Every structure is written in C-alpha cells, then in structure tokens.
Nucleic acid binder design. Structure first.
Ligand code: ZN
Lengths: 248, 44, 50, 94
RNA sequence: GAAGACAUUGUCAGGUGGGGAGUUUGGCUGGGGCGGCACAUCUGUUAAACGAUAACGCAGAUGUCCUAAGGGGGGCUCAUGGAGAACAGAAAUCUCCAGUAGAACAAAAGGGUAAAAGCCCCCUUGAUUUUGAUUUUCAGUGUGAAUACAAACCAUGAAAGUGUGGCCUAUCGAUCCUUUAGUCCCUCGGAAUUUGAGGCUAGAGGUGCCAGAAAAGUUACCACAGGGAUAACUGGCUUGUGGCAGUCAAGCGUUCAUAGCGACAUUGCUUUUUGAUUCUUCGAUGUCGGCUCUUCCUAUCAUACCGAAGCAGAAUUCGGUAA
RNA sequence: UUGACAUUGUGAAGAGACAUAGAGGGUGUAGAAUAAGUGGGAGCUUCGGCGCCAGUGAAAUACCACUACCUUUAUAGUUUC
RNA sequence: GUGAUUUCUGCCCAGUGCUCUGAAUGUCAAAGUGAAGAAAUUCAACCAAGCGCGGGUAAACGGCGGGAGUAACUAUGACU
RNA sequence: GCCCUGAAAAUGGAUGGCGCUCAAGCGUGUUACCUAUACUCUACCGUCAGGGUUGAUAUGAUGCCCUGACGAGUAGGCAGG
RNA sequence: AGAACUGGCGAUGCGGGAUGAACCGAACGUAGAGUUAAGGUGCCGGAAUACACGCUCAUCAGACACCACAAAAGGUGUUAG
RNA sequence: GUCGAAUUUGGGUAUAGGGGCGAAAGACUAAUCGAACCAUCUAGUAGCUGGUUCCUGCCGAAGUUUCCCUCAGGAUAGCAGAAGCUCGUAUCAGUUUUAUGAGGUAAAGCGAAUGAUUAGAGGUUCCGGGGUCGAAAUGACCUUGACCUAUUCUCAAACUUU
RNA sequence: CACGGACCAAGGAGUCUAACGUCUAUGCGAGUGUUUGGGUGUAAAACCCAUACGCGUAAUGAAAGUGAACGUAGGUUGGGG
C-alpha cells in the first residue's frame, strides 16, 4: 500500500511544517520508500495497518480529504482470500497559514456572519480564519470545505512590505491581539510620493512606528474571482496587514 | 428497509442521524422524537 | 419510497377503534335549567365495564 | 505593472488626426441595466415553474484580467481603448 | 353560550421542505481505480544526415514578468587568472597585463550576440491608426504567435537608418448575454420632440475537459442491448523470478583444491511455479478440495545388480544402469 | 410557517419617525478650566477679553474658514406601533 | 429506541440535530413610505419569520487521543 | 570438418511415411529429366481503342468490316440483360 | 507495448514448403501444343538406385531456408593441417 | 416442531398500485412484485446484435490526417467509381545523367563530468534558506546548513573541428 | 472446440411523400408555369381560358438607402474554327 499526499498549490507552506513535524514526532518508521511528485509526494508501506496509522496522525494535525482504492494482484485459489495493492489519496486543503481569502456568502453567513474578506490564521485539524478589520475568529472543518471548495485569492508571494508611521491602539482587544487604526505607507511611494493608507489592523499590540511590516495591497491588484466580484468594492480595505519583518 | 422508514436500512441497526425531528417537518419525516426540548434520562 | 405506518393510520380502515362491546359514550348530561338553577336527582342502576 | 497617467498617442478625431496628449485611466464596466433585451428575455423565461433554464458558469480557471486603458485626448476629449496583457498587479504611475 | 372585525377563507411574497418528483454523476489509460495530464502549448532527445514520424517514452518548462527588462542613439567591455597598494584578511575599494566570450541578455532548454543583442548614460512611447497579403500548427478553416510591404502620425539620431512590443523559439480563448470607445451614423415601421431600447465597426468580462454540456453517490435486490475490441477459472507464447542440471571452485573438509560441502560467476533445461501478454470461450467449455479409478514420465524413497569412499566388520554416504 | 392586501364595519386612549425655531451638545492625574475637526489665527474687539512664550498636554484656547459631538420642547401636520 | 430477571448504565453540548419563557439590528422579500425625474424607472430609510449571537439538551446522532514536568536515578491507570 | 557426451517429461509416433549406410546422409561440382492458371504460338468469347463503309445493298450506321492490346478481385460504383 | 521504409495479406486463387492467411516462384478469360520458374528425380510420386572428389557408423545418426528449438565444456573417435 | 392457545379455520366485510398490508423477509398483493395486471400513446428510441431475395460484364479500395463529453460512432481530407468538357502529343514522369545547393546520422577523433568516484587525507566558515512560537522589547527552537586541495583507479562517457 | 441453421412449402426486408443538390432528356425561351378557379365535356379523362401569383430578368448594406458602358462593352497572353 501507499499514500499519496498532495497540496494543489505552487507554494506549500503547510507541507514543510508537516514534514518537519513528522520528523519531530518520528512517525516515519515503516516507510520503505519516499517518492517526490509534482505538488506533493508519496509514502510506501507493506501493510494497510501502518498506512492507516499515519493517516490517523495526519487527520489530527492537518486537514485532509482521504480515500482508498485497490488493484488486484493475485486471485489466491483454495481460499478465496486474494492479495492486493492499496492506494490512499490524501488531499490537503490548499490554504496556508497567512492567505487572503474570500469566503462564500452562505458559508460566511453561517460561521458568525463574518465578512468574506478574511485571513487564515492557524492550520490544524481544522482551518481557522480571522477578520483583521475587527477581531472575529472562525473555524471551518474539512468536511465543510470539501463540500463546496473554494480557493485563496492571494498567496504569500503576492505580499509586499510597508513602513508603519502611526499606531493608534484605540481599538478593542482580545487575547494576544488588539485592534488599531494604523496609518501606513508603501516603500515604493515614500521618498517619492506622499500618499498614505489608514488601516484597522490587528497589530496595534505588536508593530510600532518605524518598522517594516508585510501586507496585501488590493488597489493595485488585478484579481478575477467571482466571489470578490460579489462584494461591495467601497467597503473593501485597500491594504491588509499580515505580519512583521523583524530586523535581524 | 429505507423505503419503509427513515431509520431503516444499514448493515447494522443504526439510525444514522438524530431522532430529534423538528416540529415544522412533514409527513414521513416525523418518525422519532418530534419537538424535543430535551432528551435522555435526567439522573435516575 | 413507501409510506410509513404512521402515515397509513390516518385513513383508517384497519386502525379504527373496535366499538362493538362499548356501552356508549360516557358523557355528563346536558346543561339545562334544572342544572343551572337548583339541582336534579338521579339514581345508579348498575356499575358496568366498558 | 505600471503605466503612467499620460501618453502621447494618435487621436482619430476629425480635427486632430495627430499625436496628442492622452490621459489614461483604467476601464471599469457599467452596471448591467435591467431593460436590456437579454435580461428581459431571461426574466420572462424564469417566470414560471420550469426551473433554471440557462446555464451557470462554475468551472473558472483564469486568475487574471486583461487590462484595458481608456485614453482621452486633452484638446478634443475624444476617447479610445487600448488593451494590454494579463497581469496580477497594475497601477497608474502618477 | 364563547370569541370577535382577531381568526378563517382567497391572492401574492420570503423561509423551511429527500416527505416526494425529474434528471446528471467527463476522457486518456499494460484491465478498471488511485496517482499523473502525456486533455491547450514550448525546448532538447527519442528521430535512424531534407521535411513528417508514436509511446502513461526520458530530462525539464508555461497559464507569469516589465513605462522599462519596450524603442532610438552614444560611450565602454565581460567571467576569470596573475602582479601590486595602510588598516585589508581566501573576500571591502584602487591600478596594470592577459582574457573568442569560459559572462550577461526576467524566467525552461536550445540557438544567437563583442566599437553588441551585453554594462552605464541621454531623449522618448512603433506596446499608436486604417485595413489587407503571407508563414507556422492546418482541412490549407479557426484561435494564438510571428514575417514583409503600403497609406498616416510620431519618436530617436548629425545622418544613413531603425522602431507596428520584449534577441528567436511557449506564455493563451467562439456563438448567445452584458458593457465600454467611436460615426454623432441607422431604426423604434401613422407624423414629431425628449428619455429608453435595439443596431453597425473595433475591444474587454470565459469557457484550462483550453474548436468551448449547467450536474453527487450506492446496489450483495438489480435490469436491458452487446462485447474475448476486455478482464473470469482452463489453455497457447515468454522466462525476470521459482525448481533442476553442467563448466570455472576462493576456500572448508586432522598437513592431504571435489572421499564430501561450498564462492564469484557463467552457459542452459522443464511447464510440473509466480509474473506478462490478451491470442481462443462473453446467444452455457459448470469454477477449490476430497472419495473413486486407470495409465504414463524419471529428475529412484525402497527393492535387484554394480562402482567409489577418513568402505576392518557392522553401519552409512556418494555414484551408474534401472521406472 | 411569517408578512401584505381583500373579506372588514363602528371607536377611545397612549407612545414613536419626519416637518421650521430650538439649544441644554465638549466632564481619563487635570492642566484656571466641561477639549471635535479644524482657519489663515495673535489678533478683531468698548472696556483689550484672552492668547501667543508659558503650563498636563491627546486637547490648544481668543476670534472664527464658521461644517461644527449637536442632546428636548413648540408648531400645520405628514403616519408606523 | 432498547429488548425477561439480578447488578450497572461512566466522562463529554465543542460539531451536526432539536429546543428556548434570553439580547437587539448584524442581515432581512412583496406591499407600503420618502426623494429625483416629464414619466417609465432609479436610489434611500423602515423592515416579519428565518439566519446569526447566547443558553440548554447525550436511555438525541454520536465521540471518548497525544504529549510535556514533578532536584542524585523514577516519572507513574498520580500530580500539575 | 564430421561423430559422440552435455541434451530430462509425461496417450503410441513421426527427415511427411516406408526405409536408407562406398546413402536414398553431409560439403561441393557436371549434365540429363519432371511440371504451375507463369512465358511463346494458334483458335474462341468479351471489353477497350484506332480505322473503313449511308458506294448505297435488306432504305437499317441500332449495324457490317479490318487491326492491335487486354482480362485477378472483397466493400463499393456503372452498364447490358 | 510504440514507431520508420518497402512489400504483402486483408480483398488472392495457382505450382512448391507434407500440412499452414503472410515464406519461395508467380498473379487467373475458355481450351490445345511447347518451355520453364521455386522445388525436386529409391518407392509412395510424374522425373537419373546418374557421373565425379571426399567425410561420417550415431545403444534417442542425419536429411527442403522462414520452421517448429539448442548452448558453454570435453573426447588420441576419426580426417586434414 | 407445535398441539388449548399471540391457536387453526369457513363465510361476510374494509383497505388497491408509487398505492395497500407487513410479529419487517423488500415479504405478500390470483404460478406475476426493489413497484401487479389490461388496453392506448407505440411501429417507444437504440452510436448495439442478427438478417437483407436474379445473372453476366467493366473499373475497383480503406483501416490514415484534423475537430468532436470524442475512442464499437460522426463530419472533413484522402483513396475509388460514374458523367463527361476543352484540346490533340503538349510538356509530364515513384527513373537516370550533368551542373549547383541544404543536411550533420554511420564512421572517425578528443579527453573528460557530478553523483556511488571502491574515494583518499581534511578545512571549518558561519554563505544561509524554510517551519513554529514570537502584546517581536530583545528574539529562541526543533530543521536543513558545512566543506579542501590531490585527483587516482575502470572507463563510467558529455561533447563537438572533419 | 465463436454465433444461427432438423426438414419442405407459402409469406418475408432501402419503399411512399414534402422540400432540395449535381447530372441527363424534352418544351418554350428573358421569359416560363394550362389544371386555385372558370368554360366545356362522349364526363374523376380529354379540350379552351382571363387576372393574379411564383421563380427568373439587379446587386449591395444591419438599416435608412443608393443602384451597374471613358472605351469599336477595354488592354495583354494563349485559344478551336
Ligand atoms: Zn483628439
């Protein structure tokens, strides 16, 4: 038997985390061969019972849509009990830790009436979402994703760095995170232009004026997503801050 | 078997889904506990 | 699908009440002047089983 | 990609017919009126028991849009449309 | 007696509604299913000295990037090595010699390129308009990309000249529908005005299953038309692996390479084993084992006769004919 | 199942949104001080009223570029509960 | 639903379901109201149930893993 | 070069068989001989082509006459019957 | 399993290879005579138990290419070198 | 097996087809049931199977290109037939020669390239990416980083001048 | 050793239609078509017929709309007769 892990994305952030974790826990003992692939890889085993062990290991740490198929090897006579080659298809959810997404209308209306403009926040057995404009966290299961799958609007590569100017933590707070009313500029318009963007981020407790952060700039983007085309373009943020590029 | 009843069928004897039916359900669905505010034994 | 025995209990035809041996409908007497004003006396002739 | 807010380009006007200065700005579509013949027809067709009667497109593949620039002459106010390639990032270079 | 212009009843509208109805649930394919996309395309190789030439054949690649990484002109020459200069080190900056490209040219590989197609600087928007002819895939249809001119307007340069995107080869899309730009053109058909609508000419929104259906499963209760174009048990071909044999025999076998056992390998046998093929059977070849019964093969377990042995006898081993 | 219209007539009270003038509109240690954006703002005002520097400052004041957090009544009513 | 009797029926309301005598505006159709317009029409506010939020519920569907630390060693079917 | 051993498989059996040993075997060479719907000659049928003939006889040319070549055939096409 | 060139079968009979869809020869109107192909001439079987120089005796010889199987290693068995 | 009862049974009577009844097997519903029977729409459609009627003569193929929810099928081009039209030995040909061009395979020739080179002695820099946790103030972790010349040995062999 | 066929007789399977394409024959010929209908009739036939209509004689364009001789109805190359 064998399992075929795939994440249908070019950049696979939840995969390196996964294999790092696999070596951390040492769950790759009965692995007889590891074969790379286009977008994921494979793990080979000599008994179904050690493959399902690792499937159980995966379905607790990351979200998956797993299956099973058989090919017939040799119809053993005198018993009726033949032998076979198995194959499991694991599909990881194609969303990573820090991706901008646009949920569908009816799903967002059910996961707390959260806005569709969303950032992924944490990857586990379930996939966790957060609205940065206002601290509202949700959680979505794979059994609900794979019913009506959607795809991210922008990956981590499309990020671009900004330089923060003023940090107003007037906003409300939650654990580990606090809402702000930052003003912030781009490090291709500073020094040359004098236009600034004001953002209701969730980094009032982290980022101080004069350090480089990382965010999506929506106004310069040329997206085509039928869901994004279903939103009120005027209530869209022109910037979405994500993380901080601390200097080392 | 499932023609006969919603609880029907299966390679075991299981309902599959909850027996707490709604009140606004229809004829042929209301086979269980109909508008349960509560189920189960309280303490004994 | 079929219809369940709950759905089949509404037209009757075998789920009717078996009403041969019943003495009758057990019902208080009708509200009349004697019972709105004063009283009226009656007497038991037999206790029976329904 | 970047494209500045001005460029000198051929105006097809009756008066110009020369290279003139043109203000460029991105093309945004209209609001999809309701008294269009092909919306009236759709309404009339959906009106009934019927069902959904026309297709519905799910199987998207493209992740971009071809960029269209609306140029406008500064002396004629005559307009024009140019198209570019597909891109994920576009801004006007003011 | 109760309730009372509320219920009820009628018509619309929203929600709920597998309780029920109707339908669908892609292709390629060393079976089908996973996986992959060889389903639209690019490079080298397959490919066998024009061209064409397949495989779920190999090594890779595309669904992007750029107002400069496009265009024109000018000036300079790169990787690298050597000899030198305080801090200075294998390596910071400066100078000389050699240097046919061993560098770089957004990105795959291939081709190409040196007063350049590269490195720096200057001016710019030919990444423009009208429409046609041609080459490539090819039906000589489309789409896509390119080639060469014409009529205009522009840039650049002293000028010759070059420039109709990227040094060349890939980097993308029909009808219907919607929308925008334009002539300020046509029509709204009893005659007019203003809105509104429809039209013509170029474009965009998209079908990636990429010449382009709107779509989830199960049947072990199942069914029909058919198929050895195709799995099923049987065979027939093949020998990777199975079982057996022969030659080389390191070396172990009280010192005494085969009395005997065993390397490296090497040639090669049988169909009595798996794998592989799909050639015969899909409008009936009845599919495990056992009971029964007969015959054949020898690659001999015993029996008979021989030979050799670290074969005294005894007991064993090996060996030969022999079924 | 919920809403609207009709069936559907006759009433009485109360509360609520618009419609002109209202202004009660500015309250962390506290800086005198009950501090919204602001506007040139150190000056227009009768007495200079204060401010400018100063002083917590988040606020910077007077005066106004005069939009100004903008709170409850009164109007002829417009009408939902 | 379970299936005589006897003895027991543990821990979970996060999820899906069901439910509520809980909050109020976040969404929220048709009719109705207001504004612009010559009008068709367009826009806005108000807006029922439902959704959403909060709670309850397991003899309701069902689920009941893996670590990291208790000082020389030991980290327990303990403790954090 | 030949021959032998190596070289073992299952109904009784296959240089095709009998049978052959200075071959009726193997290598090589020389003539003679046998025979296919093939080749050559002739006759006949048919088709294809070229040409002569309305002198005018049976006015008919639908024909008559001369010359040469050729003939496989599934699906399928046409013609004459 | 997948390709390139030619030829053929399929659509194709005839002589030969005993037999065979594909090999050799050769492509077909009905018949006669003659000559040959590829293959063959002991008898079956039409045709030389023909000629010539040599090799081989096999206790499963050998005998018409495709074809219907055969290697490595050995023999003073023999022949020639 | 059961045999005094949830017993067996006649007659009458109710329930009728996506409906009935079911101590529940998808069982029974007139030899019919995972949806009865009868007539009609109905000569249902079938890219699938089978068959397809007389003679002779002449000519005579294809299993390949491109597109198709396309792979037991269609359109398209090709092959083939028939009808002939304009003309009358042109200028044509599955061919050769002469002249002039393109090619980069066979052959030839060179040493080499990063791995396992069967490796050998070493040289240590930090040259770091990526993942998690970072009210990031300063920053840690599991992870992957490192290499220095000598290049043998046998030929593994990538190339091009001709 | 794939499917059908025990046997005989009779029946038994690319037709009819509407609208069309190429080709051919015939009539008339920038015209053509008699046959909806009418007159007439030896009576479903045959014979006679006006008007209109159809196709064609003029195309193009989305449409409004415009609408085919510079010339011995052109020049050059070939061209039967
Ligand atoms: Zn202009």
């Amino acid at each position: 038997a064998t399992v075929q892990i795939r994440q249908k994305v070019p950049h696979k952030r939840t995969f390196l985390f996964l294999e790092q974790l696999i070596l951390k826990h040492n769950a790759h003992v009965d692995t007889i061969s590891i074969s790379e692939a286009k977008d994921g890889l494979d793990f080979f085993y000599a008994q179904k019972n050690h493959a399902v062990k690792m499937i159980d290991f995966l379905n607790a740490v990351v979200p998956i849509k797993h299956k099973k198929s058989e090919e017939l090897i040799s119809q053993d006579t005198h018993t009726g009990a033949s032998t076979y080659k198995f194959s499991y298809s694991v599909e990881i959810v194609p969303i990573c830790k820090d991706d901008l997404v646009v949920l569908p209308k009816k799903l967002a209306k059910s996961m707390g009436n959260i806005s569709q403009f969303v950032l992924c926040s944490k990857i586990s057995n379930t996939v966790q979402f957060m609205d940065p404009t206002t601290l509202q966290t949700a959680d979505l299961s794979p059994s609900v994703y794979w019913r009506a799958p959607f795809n991210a609007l922008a990956d981590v590569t499309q990020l671009v760095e900004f330089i923060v100017l003023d940090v107003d933590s007037t906003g409300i707070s939650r654990g580990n995170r606090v809402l702000a009313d930052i003003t912030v500029a781009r490090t291709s318009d500073l020094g040359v232009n004098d236009q600034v963007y004001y953002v209701r981020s969730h980094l009032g407790g982290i980022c101080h004026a004069g350090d480089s952060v990382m965010g999506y700039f929506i106004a310069n983007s040329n997206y085509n997503s039928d869901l994004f085309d279903g939103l009120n373009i005027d209530y869209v943020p022109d910037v979405v801050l994500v993380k901080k590029l601390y200097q080392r | 078997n499932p023609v006969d009843h919603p609880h029907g069928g299966g390679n075991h004897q299981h309902i599959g889904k909850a027996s707490t039916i709604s009140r606004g359900a229809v004829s042929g669905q209301k086979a269980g506990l109909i508008a349960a505010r509560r189920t189960g034994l309280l303490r004994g | 699908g079929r219809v369940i025995r709950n759905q089949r209990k509404g037209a009757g035809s075998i789920f009717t009440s078996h009403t041969r041996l019943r003495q009758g409908a057990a019902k208080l007497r009708t509200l009349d002047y004697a019972e709105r004003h004063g009283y009226i006396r009656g007497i038991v002739k037999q206790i029976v089983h329904d | 990609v970047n494209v500045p807010k001005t460029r000198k380009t051929y105006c097809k006007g009756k008066t110009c017919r020369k290279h003139t200065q043109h203000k460029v700005t991105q093309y945004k579509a209209g609001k999809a009126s309701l008294f269009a013949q092909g919306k009236r027809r759709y309404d009339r067709k959906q009106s009934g028991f019927g069902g959904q009667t026309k297709p519905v497109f799910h199987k998207k593949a493209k992740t971009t849009k071809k960029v269209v620039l609306r140029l406008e002459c500064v002396k004629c106010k005559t307009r024009a449309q140019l198209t570019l390639k597909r891109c994920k990032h576009f801004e006007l270079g003011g």
